[PDB]
Design a protein around this nucleic acid. Structure first.
Ligand SMILES: [Mg+2]
Ligand SMILES: [Mg+2]
Ligand SMILES: [Mg+2]
Ligand SMILES: [Mg+2]
Ligand SMILES: [Mg+2]
Ligand SMILES: [Mg+2]
Ligand SMILES: [Mg+2]
Ligand SMILES: [Mg+2]
Ligand SMILES: [Mg+2]
Ligand SMILES: [Mg+2]
Lengths: 213, 52, 224, 13, 87
RNA sequence: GAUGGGGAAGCUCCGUUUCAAAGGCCUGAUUUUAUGCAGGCCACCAUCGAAAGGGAAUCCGGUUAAGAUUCCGGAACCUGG
RNA sequence: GCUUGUGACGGCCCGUGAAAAUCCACAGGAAGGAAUAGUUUUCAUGCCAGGUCGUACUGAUAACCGCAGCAGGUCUCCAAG
RNA sequence: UUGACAUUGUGAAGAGACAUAGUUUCUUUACUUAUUCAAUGAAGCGGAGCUGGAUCCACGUUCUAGCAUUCAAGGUCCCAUUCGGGGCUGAUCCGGGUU
């Protein structure tokens, strides 16, 4: 039969992401000596909207430890973080909202976001708006940390993996009805070509396993 | 801007051009007060170490 | 001096820009440098079979110095003085020459025919199979031999860049006693001293961090 | 006088 | 014609510093100084030192670029290379 | 869309800064060993892709069978030296 | 009043609505620079130069496509009572 | 998707086979050196300090939208004092592994 859209999407082409207006990839700092041993201070310069993303982003400026210059990082803003705020990242950073800490430095019941799946990948878990990870417990002998994920899954991560204290901002977004095809249209114009969706039953037998009748 | 004299592009003050008068005033005030507070913190910590 | 002040710099985390430091340990070397260093490291780390590993036991400094002093008296005839000999022989129309024998095929033939008084074998020959059979051959034929450090040193001996082997076959009467004394010295210092340990495997060496890990774990097991 | 190769001197101080 | 780039013509092209001249001749400092003494190459002063040196006031030795270009063709330089190979 | 690399029997294909020794600059009478270059600094990628996107600077009057913010007369401006 | 430009504002988004070349400013202070003489080409005036290719005309019930001088098709500016 | 063979190495302990001298076979548990994954500005890894304070830590950084760059000032030996230039430190040492 004819190749279906589910198979046609993998070739790329007209299904690639629409990334013209995106602010940049939202990552933590590269895990360096300062964050491995002490802490480094940055300043929140602006909080911006990123096209195609529910969560707002924060632009945080740090000083380069090896060269006289500034370095700008793009974080996902946690709720309560404001412009002009001092953010502290590292092993020795305090337990305050917006700070970047290793999981082994936080107690049980701590709520984190943008959690690293492995130490150094610069954030993989709980990045969408309103989502967070809970620290279940520690296994200090294995240098491991048990966490609970937004899906309900329990995971074991290295205790050197980092996370941002607090919950991703922008929560409650999906509770408002769109009401309109046009609003769904503008939602997907900034993300990718997956809308509108034609039902497989609605098709001829050649186009889909479900077609015909 | 390359066709005009320096008078048209600056004002006679520190950061004249780049920064406005109130922002310049704020960074002057903050620089002074923070350096004084750093002296205070070093004094307090030295007293704390001397007694401890 | 009233005009000078002390302004010590804080180079802690979150402070002044770090000063320049020696980063020789972290240099991203070129690929050929990395290959040659890792190849030497691998030759150390792997377990080395005895026929290869015997080439780590060479003549000592003093014995090598005396040996090369002996061989430099029999450095072969050069290309500049060969032409002088030929013109003199055309006028006559020359005694028997004394020289160091060199060349792998030639020296192997001399060992097999037992014409070699003393054989020097370079340790750093690549491919190593060119010389890896030579010590057993010399032992089987009853020829004194010594493994020496430097094919380039042997090349200086025989007017070349490198030389895998060198051999003394015939010596002058002024040096027969020196040759015999050197053969006795080599027998006492090289062949007898390293006779057992040449039958051992080599290369049982761990890296620095792996050794530290093993030492820490053994200490932790032995004491708590 | 005129050049034949790509590197020339032609000797004029 | 498009807009030309500054610091490329006039004093900037007319004068060459000692570091640039040594680099262009691909010799050492000692060889370069001896070649200048042999040929009568002498240091020079731009009327506009900042224009000649990209706005710096730092003390610099300048030469005529055409003088250095003519110095490139001196056979004593090739003799110097021959002596280095011999050594 | 080349190079460095890696696929492919091959026509060629991947990929776009990597997986490369990918190049510029400053100082020197380097405590002299006598005619051989020493001490340092800084760093990321070819190229093409818009006569509606970005962009240095010009106007009036006159003039031809047919040219014109381009020629003529007058009056300006930009850029580089 | 019509058209157009612009300002200060307001409404709207689970939509918040390009990049780069290029130009300037600031911070810094390597340095350089006067007493019988210096400095300043970001003030004025004065000197020299600006290459290559396009440029006619139609743009449509006859200058384009539709086998045509074809009632079809084909992007846009100005616009009086 | 599942099995075999090859890529494929090094130990230790426990069960055998030469009839109670060490050449091999199998389970357990290790190791790294091949292979695999990821990152970086291959920058601070690993070990130790007759280093210090209390097995652990650098007591060099947390009211504030400031500032942090010219081989680093200071200290101490020299030079041949002349406009400055060297060395030790400031900033512990060692490694045959960039993480
Ligand atoms: Mg149908
Ligand atoms: Mg291609
Ligand atoms: Mg182009
Ligand atoms: Mg345009
Ligand atoms: Mg006309
Ligand atoms: Mg004219
Ligand atoms: Mg026309
Ligand atoms: Mg027309
Ligand atoms: Mg036609
Ligand atoms: Mg046709």
């Amino acid at each position: 039969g004819r190749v279906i859209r589910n198979q046609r999407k993998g070739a790329g082409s007209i299904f690639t992401s629409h990334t013209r207006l995106r602010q940049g990839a939202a990552k933590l700092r590269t895990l360096d000596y300062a964050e491995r041993h002490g802490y480094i201070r940055g300043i929140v310069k602006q909080i911006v909207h990123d096209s195609g993303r529910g969560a707002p982003l924060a632009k945080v400026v740090f000083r380069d430890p090896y060269k006289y210059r500034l370095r700008e990082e793009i974080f996902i803003a946690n709720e309560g973080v404001h412009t002009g705020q001092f953010i502290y990242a590292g092993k020795k950073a305090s337990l305050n909202v917006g700070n970047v800490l290793p999981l082994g430095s936080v107690p049980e019941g701590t709520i984190v976001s943008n959690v690293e799946e492995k130490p150094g990948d610069r954030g993989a878990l709980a990045r969408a708006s309103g989502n967070y990870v809970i620290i279940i417990g520690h296994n200090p002998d294995e240098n491991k940390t048990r966490v609970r994920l937004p899906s309900g899954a329990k995971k074991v991560i290295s205790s050197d993996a980092r996370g941002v204290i607090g919950v991703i901002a922008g929560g409650g977004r999906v509770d408002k009805p769109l009401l309109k095809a046009g609003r769904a249209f503008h939602k997907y114009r900034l993300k990718r070509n997956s809308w509108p969706k034609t039902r497989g039953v609605a098709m001829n037998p050649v186009d889909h396993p479900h077609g015909g009748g | 801007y390359a066709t005009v004299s320096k008078t048209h592009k600056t004002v006679s003050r520190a950061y004249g051009g780049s920064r406005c008068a109130n922002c310049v005033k704020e960074r002057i005030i903050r620089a002074f007060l923070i350096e004084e507070q750093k002296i205070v913190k070093k004094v307090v910590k030295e007293q704390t170490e001397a007694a401890k | 001096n009233p005009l000078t002040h002390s302004t010590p710099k804080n180079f802690g985390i979150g402070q002044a820009v770090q000063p320049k430091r020696n980063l020789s340990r972290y240099v991203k070397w070129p690929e050929y440098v990395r290959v040659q260093r890792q190849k030497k490291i691998l030759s150390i780390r792997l377990k080395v079979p005895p026929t290869i590993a015997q080439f780590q036991y060479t003549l000592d400094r003093n014995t090598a110095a005396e040996t090369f002093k002996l061989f430099n008296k029999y450095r072969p005839e050069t290309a500049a003085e060969k032409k002088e000999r030929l013109t003199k022989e055309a006028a006559a129309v020359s005694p028997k020459p004394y020289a160091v024998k060199y060349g792998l095929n030639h020296v192997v033939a001399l060992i097999e025919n037992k014409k070699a008084k003393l054989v020097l074998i370079a340790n750093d020959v690549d491919p190593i199979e060119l010389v890896v059979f030579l010590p057993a051959l010399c032992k089987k034929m009853g020829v004194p031999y010594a493994i020496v450090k430097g094919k380039a040193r042997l090349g200086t001996l025989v007017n070349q860049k490198t030389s895998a082997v060198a051999a003394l076959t015939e010596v002058r009467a002024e040096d027969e006693a020196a040759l015999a004394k050197l053969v006795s010295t080599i027998d006492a210092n090289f062949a007898d001293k390293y006779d057992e340990v040449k039958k051992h495997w080599g290369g049982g060496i761990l890296g620095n961090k792996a050794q530290a890990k093993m030492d820490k774990r053994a200490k932790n097991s032995d004491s708590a | 006088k005129k050049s034949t190769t790509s590197w020339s001197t032609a000797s004029v101080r | 014609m498009r807009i030309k780039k500054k610091n490329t013509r006039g004093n900037a092209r007319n004068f060459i510093t000692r570091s640039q001249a040594v680099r262009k001749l691909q010799v050492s400092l000692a060889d370069f100084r001896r070649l200048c003494i042999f040929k009568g190459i002498y240091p020079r002063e731009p009327r506009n030192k900042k224009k000649a040196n990209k706005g710096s006031t730092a003390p610099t030795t300048f030469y005529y670029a055409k003088d250095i270009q003519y110095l490139m063709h001196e056979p004593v330089l090739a003799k110097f290379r021959e002596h280095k190979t011999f050594a």
